Subunit: 127 residues, 4 copies
């Protein structure tokens, strides 16, 4: 349904700026919000919960063993309810033409927004 590799790209991109602890904090929020139990993550009742849940989650992301793949696959729901819509969209655009068009439209829009800034800049220099 969604290749582990591509779940990895979106996961690394989500953690690109503020580190891995943000996506982990969010995913874990959702996870417990959804009443999940698989894979197992530590709740706030545990000493360094976040740091530990962060290492567990990203270890699975990086590994490629059938085990890893199964745990992240079970985590997709918490991921999808947590991850930035745009990233979720990019993650699914590999296995879906719909999401692929959604990301392509948005990108076409951002380019045009920037072509506007460009034409607006030159032209201002032309006083």
């Amino acid at each position: 349904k969604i290749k582990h590799e591509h779940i990895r790209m979106a996961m690394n991109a989500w953690a690109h700026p503020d580190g891995e602890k943000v996506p982990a904090a969010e995913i874990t929020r959702a996870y417990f919000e959804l009443g999940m139990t698989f894979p197992e993550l530590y709740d706030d009742s545990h000493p360094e919960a976040l740091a530990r849940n962060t290492q567990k989650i990203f270890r699975w992301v990086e590994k490629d063993t059938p085990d890893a793949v199964e745990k992240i696959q079970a985590l997709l729901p918490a991921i999808e309810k947590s991850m930035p819509p745009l990233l979720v969209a990019r993650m699914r655009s590999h296995s879906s033409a719909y999401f692929r068009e959604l990301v392509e439209t948005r990108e076409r829009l951002v380019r045009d927004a920037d072509d506007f800034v460009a034409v607006a800049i030159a032209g201002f220099n032309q006083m």
Copy 2:
């Protein structure tokens, strides 16, 4: 530079939504702010200030006699100041490469917007 017929085109477009009186009241206020004396307009003095200015201005726009042309040209400054920016961009694109590109880019941003809708609905196919 700006041809009399380009001004007409934008003038009628402005007038279309709510009638010629909105553009007239708008151009008047701007007219009396720049302290213009030519062409002659009517002060908020006259009982039928608006209505009489409306008749006079669009009668010039609608005609192609050198006198109607001359008066709309002198009125251009007040028009540019009160006229909706998009209509101004459009009015000036026939005379300027910059505004052509500027308007062309918004048309492109708007098609993108509609492409988004197209995709969001092209999805009702699957549910």
Copy 3:
């Protein structure tokens, strides 16, 4: 589904620029591509077929009678199939909150695009 009145909103809006002949022609093509038989529409095996059923379709849109109403619902599929996505979203917005939100976001993008032009105008 979609109230008859709303279809009339999008149907007229769709005929405002190029005329009646375009919507009618689009609908007819979608109609035959869907292999539809009700309501009755004239194929190319007729003389001025396009002019003949451009009359029927809009004769149904303008009325509110049970027969006009039923024949339009029957045509919806060909209408949703050929109508421009934007007009379709407007159409279904009166009944769907999802489609209403979709249309609102489209308006904001457009407004933001107009704000761009103004800013560059302000810099004159």
Copy 4:
């Protein structure tokens, strides 16, 4: 007009994606197109050119001395000719409303686009 500290922010931002070699490769090209001579930049008929121009350029970016500042100022024309437009607009927005209103309008445009994505996803 443009404060050295603000040129540094945009320069570093332009550098973060693929490193400092990109800006320098780009600024260098514009430098020679405009036919500039100050400060000194090594042309292609030089072995380690790019590597040398990169160290030179970001060395002035890092500092706040009169020498570094006047050299980046002299370079501004080549910077503006090559730097991503949105970066150039951000850079000169600290001192101009026009460029600030531009940045801001672009941000909304992207937020509302991301808004559409979120909405369209929630949908199908």
